Write a protein that binds this ligand. Sequence first.
Ligand SMILES: *[C@@H]1O[C@H](CO)[C@@H](O)[C@H](O)[C@H]1NC(C)=O
Lengths: 41, 246
Amino acid sequence: YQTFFNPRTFGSGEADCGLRPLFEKKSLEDKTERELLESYI
Amino acid sequence: IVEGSDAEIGMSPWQVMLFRKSPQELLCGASLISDRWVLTAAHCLLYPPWDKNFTENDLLVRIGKHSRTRYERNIEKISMLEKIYIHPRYNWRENLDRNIALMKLKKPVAFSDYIHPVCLPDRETAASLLQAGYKGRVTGWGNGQPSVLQVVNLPIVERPVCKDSTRIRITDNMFCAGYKPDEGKRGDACEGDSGGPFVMKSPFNNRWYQMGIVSWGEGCDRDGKYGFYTHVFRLKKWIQKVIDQF
Ligand SMILES: *[C@@H]1O[C@H](CO)[C@@H](O)[C@H](O)[C@H]1NC(C)=O
């Protein structure tokens, strides 16, 4: 229980959040994510 | 979604679709934030002017879908809802301030290559990424309508421009995003995308964060206006209070 939400009530998932099994986890990029990252000046 | 492109399989694994049980109809988008909690817009569940006031047993959600019309065997999952919680200060008669709701799944969903939660922003992420010009992403089906999930990337708008684009009284709990009415581009979220997530990818840790919740829309035309989004980071402590008790 070092996460912001208590897993007892939140359930599982917080620690590995936001890393997509088919993209980030495989070092693969989607077709338009560059457009987002390039906008972050 | 209007003027978007085909999303790729597994590209938005936190996307959740909310349906009316009977008669069966797609109502709104939503997002998976854990194996048992889903975030959406309050107006997807409660909007008295249209006689909308759903209870847990009136709805269901489908998770892990890509095709709107094809049933994806052993991929998509369906879940009933145990409880719905709408923000007590949600202002439906005026400006839709605090337009946010949480839904607890009757049973946790199993994560897979197609189902995975999105992150909620921490302070540094919100301060760093929620800036005019920076783009976020919205996903949903096309609307004749669509075959597969569509995606659009939209830039956050300066607050003075948002404020002058509408007669409603905006609050700091919402932000607006979209391209200028000219046509530098003009993809956008639509009515059917209400409740879905507006996500941004942190260049710092490679993770996707849900910065907003698609607010009100009617059709796919805003008559020169910008779509609004509920500011998730500002409502983070409310989300925690509901979950830590629910
Ligand atoms: C029923 O709908 C009314 C009118 O929209 C709303 O004020 C009330 O909170 C709803 N009832 C419950 C307990 O969900």
